[PDB]
Nucleic acid binder design. Structure first.
Length: 71
DNA sequence: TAGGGAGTAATCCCCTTGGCGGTTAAAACGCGGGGGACAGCGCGTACGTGCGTTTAAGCGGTGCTAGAGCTTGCTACGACCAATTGAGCGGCCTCGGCACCGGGATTCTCCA
């Protein structure tokens, strides 16, 4: 997108990237941020399984408590 | 020994029910009169009853052969599954069919 574009940064709930996943996986993302990435900490979670498969160049996991319960 | 199931409660999206308000159109209410419901009547004809006739349905009996019903043998074909793709579903788009309106024209009714 260039500066003349309908949007630049989109902000979304973890609830919607799962619910609207079929719309999200039909688009190509130039960068991704994940606030409180402890939400992604479980590999059996759909929000992990969904966001794993997003077509994105670069990703940040923002967290303050990375280690959590287990390796 | 470990993995994943059982328990539970917070989190958050979806969606059906209920209320408020208006307002407006359809249901409710009135009443005259008409005509259709319906009772009462006359006739006639058409249908139930009876008797003598006949006709053929039903029972007992003989003979035959088709074909239903069963056994045997085998191979053809549809169940099965792993690999491949394209037909058909879900989402998005737009324009043209159709409806709804208004007013002028033709039809149909009903009373004279």
């Amino acid at each position: 997108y260039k500066k003349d574009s309908p949007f630049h940064v989109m902000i979304t709930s973890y609830q919607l990237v799962v619910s609207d996943v079929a719309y999200f996986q039909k688009m190509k993302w130039q960068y991704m941020i994940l606030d409180e990435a402890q939400a992604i900490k479980s590999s059996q979670s759909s929000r992990w399984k969904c966001l794993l498969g997003f077509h994105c160049r670069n990703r940040l996991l923002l967290t303050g408590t990375p280690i959590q319960n287990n390796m």
